[PDB]
Design a protein around this ligand. Structure first.
Ligand SMILES: CC(C)(O)[C@H]1CC[C@H](NC(=O)c2cnc3nc(C4CC4)ccc3c2)CC1
Ligand SMILES: CC(C)(O)[C@H]1CC[C@H](NC(=O)c2cnc3nc(C4CC4)ccc3c2)CC1
Ligand SMILES: N[C@@H](CCC(=O)N[C@@H](CS)C(=O)NCC(=O)O)C(=O)O
Ligand SMILES: N[C@@H](CCC(=O)N[C@@H](CS)C(=O)NCC(=O)O)C(=O)O
Lengths: 199, 198
């Protein structure tokens, strides 16, 4: 048994993909959440001043997608062929690119509001349409079994729906995919048992 | 397999793939398009972006997903799962930074302001972080070159076009660039590639 400690804020955010992977693989870990009050303290110690980080047997890892890739290496979640592993990474990166456009840390309310609106109004539907086309009539995004891209799709879409509840109105196949992920017992169990935060 | 890489006539996000092909001695069609070609091609792509890599007629996208696919089971990947994690983290740290720049911005006033903002405040912190993380080592991860070293040299090249003094107080990061550039396969590609701003 290896010693895992996850450090992030109290919210889903960029740590959530790691938490889904831990739940799905049934791995016990310390889900260390922090208030903003403690943020400047810990920040000074961090290698690149960013969370989430994951401590593994006294060794520190950073970058949430780098960590998620490390944890799924050698598992069913990574993909069934070398090429399918690329597709998993590329779908994840495509989703992460779009989530990263949003100005999460913007101090000016009016600039943050205008940007969140532009992205959700013009960009988001282009992405939903491309994703819908990519999925087609298949059960999972890549190959014939669930991957951590399906986890990421579910996590990303959950946060987009908070700001734009009608996002998937004309995309029932993408809603089905969210339901299929949420129905995975280990994921269901995590969703039910997790702190209820907005983001 | 036969490889066809499609991107704009610039280093940009394709350059990491081009360094990996050079290093591994892999022949490939380096297909470069002008802006005028772009709308025609954009609709054929499942996610409407480039670069794309065609491997025996099958399309891959996302530059870093492709880089990770090409380097798997090679000396560029990182020797252990943990070191692979470090390689991914460094590349993601660098790529996060390069993504902040408003590459596609029309208004040159707000564009120059943000470029200078990022190069003034944010770039030196990242330089200091990288210099610390590198410590006593000659390469970013382990005891040999990885594609993270390539990516450093690629990202730093583009940053030095806008802020040539960025590595004045960081000679070990300069050394790292020169070590990447002294690799024969890389040196050879750098001498022969089309000379572009970006
Ligand atoms: C300390 C502070 C006030 O400066 C910080 C606190 C944390 C904030 N982060 C977010 O609000 C946030 C939330 N969800 C995200 N989800 C994603 C995608 C779905 C995985 C990506 C980035 C996200 C960023 C930024 C400001
Ligand atoms: C269609 C269009 C005309 O609107 C496009 C054309 C391509 C443009 N992209 C860039 O100029 C560009 C260039 N170098 C880059 N280098 C990086 C560094 C390596 C990681 C990241 C992003 C970059 C983006 C955006 C607008
Ligand atoms: N690409 C990185 C992004 C890390 C990141 O920027 N995280 C934010 C929280 S969502 C943070 O730590 N912000 C601190 C700051 O910039 O002051 C990842 O996915 O881990
Ligand atoms: N994270 C992606 C980004 C791809 C991307 O944004 N590419 C730009 C060119 S640098 C593009 O195709 N832009 C087309 C457009 O915005 O219309 C990658 O690394 O491949």
């Amino acid at each position: 048994m290896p010693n895992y400690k996850l450090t992030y804020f109290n919210m889903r955010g960029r740590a959530e993909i790691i938490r889904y992977i831990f739940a799905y693989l049934d791995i016990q870990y310390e889900d260390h959440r922090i208030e903003q009050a403690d943020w400047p303290e810990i920040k000074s110690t961090l290698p690149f001043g960013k969370i989430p980080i994951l401590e593994v047997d006294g060794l520190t890892l950073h970058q949430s997608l780098a960590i998620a890739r490390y944890l799924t290496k050698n598992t069913d979640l990574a993909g069934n062929t070398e090429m399918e592993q690329c597709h998993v990474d590329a779908i994840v990166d495509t989703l992460d690119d779009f989530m990263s456009c949003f100005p999460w840390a913007e101090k000016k309310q009016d600039v943050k509001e205008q940007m969140f609106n532009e992205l959700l109004t013009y960009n988001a539907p282009h992405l939903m349409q491309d994703l819908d086309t990519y999925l087609g009539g298949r059960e999972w995004l890549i190959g014939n079994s669930v991957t951590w891209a399906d986890f990421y799709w579910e996590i990303c879409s959950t946060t987009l729906l908070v700001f734009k509840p009608d996002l998937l109105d004309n995309h029932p196949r993408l809603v089905t995919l969210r339901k299929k992920v949420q129905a995975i017992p280990a994921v269901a169990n995590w969703i039910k048992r997790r702190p209820q935060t907005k983001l």
